[PDB]
Amino acid sequence: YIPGRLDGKVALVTGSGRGIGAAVAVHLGRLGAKVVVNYANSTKDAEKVVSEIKALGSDAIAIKADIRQVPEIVKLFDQAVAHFGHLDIAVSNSGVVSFGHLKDVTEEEFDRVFSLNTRGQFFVAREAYRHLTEGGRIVLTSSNTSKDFSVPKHSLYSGSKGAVDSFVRIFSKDCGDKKITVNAVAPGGTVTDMFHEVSHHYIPNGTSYTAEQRQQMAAHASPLHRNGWPQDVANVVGFLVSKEGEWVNGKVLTLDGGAA
Amino acid sequence: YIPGRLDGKVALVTGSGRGIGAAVAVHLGRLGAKVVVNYANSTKDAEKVVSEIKALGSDAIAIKADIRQVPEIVKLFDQAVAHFGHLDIAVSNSGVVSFGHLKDVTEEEFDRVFSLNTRGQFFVAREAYRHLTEGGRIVLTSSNTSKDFSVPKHSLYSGSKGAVDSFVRIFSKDCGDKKITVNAVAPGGTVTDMFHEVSHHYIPNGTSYTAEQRQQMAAHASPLHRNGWPQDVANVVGFLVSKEGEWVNGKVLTLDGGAA
Ligand SMILES: NC(=O)c1ccc[n+]([C@@H]2O[C@H](COP(=O)([O-])OP(=O)(O)OC[C@H]3O[C@@H](n4cnc5c(N)ncnc54)[C@H](OP(=O)(O)O)[C@@H]3O)[C@@H](O)[C@H]2O)c1
Ligand SMILES: NC(=O)c1ccc[n+]([C@@H]2O[C@H](COP(=O)([O-])OP(=O)(O)OC[C@H]3O[C@@H](n4cnc5c(N)ncnc54)[C@H](OP(=O)(O)O)[C@@H]3O)[C@@H](O)[C@H]2O)c1
Ligand SMILES: O=c1c(O)c(-c2ccccc2)oc2cc(O)ccc12
Known about the structure:
- The structure is a homodimer.
- The first copy, chain A, is of the alpha/beta class.
- Chain A is globular and about 50 Å long.
- In chain A, strand 2, helix 2 (43-55) and strand 3 form a beta-alpha-beta unit.
- Chain A has helices spanning 19-30, 43-55, 70-84, 107-131, 155-175, 193-202, 211-219, 230-240; strands at 10-13, 34-39, 60-64, 87-91, 132-141, 181-187, 252-255.
- Helices cover 45% and strands 16% of the residues of chain A.
- In chain A, strands 3-2-1-4-5-6-7 form a 7-stranded parallel beta sheet, sandwiched between helices.
- The first copy, chain A, has one domain (1-260): Rossmann fold (3-Layer(aba) Sandwich).
- The A-B interface holds A 70, 101-103, 105, 107, 110, 114, 118-119, 122-123, 125-126, 129-130, 145-147, 150-156, 158-167, 169-171, 173-175, 250 and B 70, 101-103, 105, 107, 110, 114, 118-119, 122-123, 125-126, 129-130, 145-147, 150-156, 158-167, 169-171, 173-175, 250.
- Chains A, B: Keywords: NADP, Nucleotide-binding, Oxidoreductase.
- Chains A, B: It comes from Cochliobolus lunatus (Filamentous fungus).
- Chains A, B: This is 17beta-hydroxysteroid dehydrogenase.
- Chains A, B: NADP(+) binds at residues 15, 18, 20, 40-42, 66-67, 93-95, 157, 161, 190, 192, 194.
- Chains A, B: One of its GO terms (molecular function) is nucleotide binding.
């Protein structure tokens, strides 16, 4: 039993077919956990992550569930436990980004973002609490924009993740009766499909720079002069879900390489 | 020199038939503003607040609108402006509280709380931005539980108000193009109808004390050894919405008499 390792444990990661979730899933597998790879649309990518986790010597299964639908969350966790027998670690990663001036945010856009980023994560946590073994781990995903980084026209998203920050602090109090810790990671700009989709909103006149230039400017936001990568987030989740992370509980760790 | 008056201004307060909203509405009237008193159910109480504002020498009208319904928000603001000619100040105060261990929180309870506390306030802000005159003021309502105070079985509510904290910081960036400031007040335990919902949870072992004892214990949580009252919040909103409050922008002010 090596320190920081997860041998014999079972982890579930939402939205782990690609992006940050994919890194987290492969990493938990690398640490020796068996992994449930949840996806909503990226079936082939989820299979690739599963194949990669098996190739590094662990086991994994891909399970489709739309995390906007609470009954599908319940089913996801039921299927997870049915397959591996038990569940120790739940990482809630699924999310969507949005931009718009307050004046033009519609009801439908509010609901598209909150239903996944906030409502979905809340019920992923609920189901995690119900299904997890004593001494388990829950990690939710927030963002540096919730508290540390203020971007015009980003109010909906920033708020969606501000709620998650508050959740984890109080979740840790409730989840303590099963000795489960609850934390969140709040990444800054991390190079994924989402990054490239929206990097132009984070930069003044972002549209008149190339996509590569925009990534390079995000690199210079950190005093380390490099971009955040999915592995950066995965490294921290892996520590939080280990035995050694136990005393970190009820906290949000901003992961922006010192940009804030 | 008389600081902080609002003569010639028009203010709208959601949920101002009773509680904190009532005190805010009466106070804005005391400062010289004309006031739109929104309520959802408390018709008679809204009439009492209107009467009180007229007694103080200002003018007011009560308008029914369910702030969960975005079309009713739009109408509320349209009617406000049609009646008084313009609108300068919007205070979003309507909210409900909730308690429950994470394991027992249902979809319906999530939606009951978020639809008013987070979604409702978000669209009150949107409509406020659209309808306010240049140089106006928006104030939303959060809670000490979002960031400063951690209460078991209070995750849903704490998160509903954490989202608001994030909103106001970014709202201030968007609203700056009409020179409108946006802030929130985050009260601690303030003696209203809601206080009776919260008091047994905000006091250690609150369940083994009388309601009067709980209020006394809540008083001893402040180093000033008294309870928070609606007027305490009203005093701060009044300053934030005055000319003199301008440089407070994008902030959440916790109002707990030094308990945090
Ligand atoms: N990347 C950044 O710079 C950054 C910064 C701060 C915070 N974050 C947060 O980090 C998390 C992941 O972001 P990312 O960069 O990996 O974004 P991404 O590349 O767009 O990936 C999004 C992930 O969310 C999943 N997803 C989308 N809709 C879903 C649904 N309805 N049900 C279940 N899963 C769904 C997607 O799975 P499918 O493709 O199968 O739908 C995918 O796995 C999000 O919570 C995001 O808010 C990202
Ligand atoms: N009191 C506390 O210790 C405390 C502490 C922290 C934060 N807060 C926040 O302070 C704000 C004021 O609360 P309070 O203490 O005054 O609570 P309260 O006595 O329960 O008053 C609730 C107010 O919300 C209004 N409201 C409820 N549902 C509504 C709806 N659908 N549409 C429009 N208005 C609605 C109610 O009006 P109707 O009767 O007409 O429905 C009433 O005016 C809330 O946002 C609350 O979260 C209160
Ligand atoms: O997609 C993002 C992004 O491109 C960037 C970004 C891109 C270029 C410069 C600075 C930031 O930041 C983010 C921060 C977040 O909390 C979430 C997403 C992004």
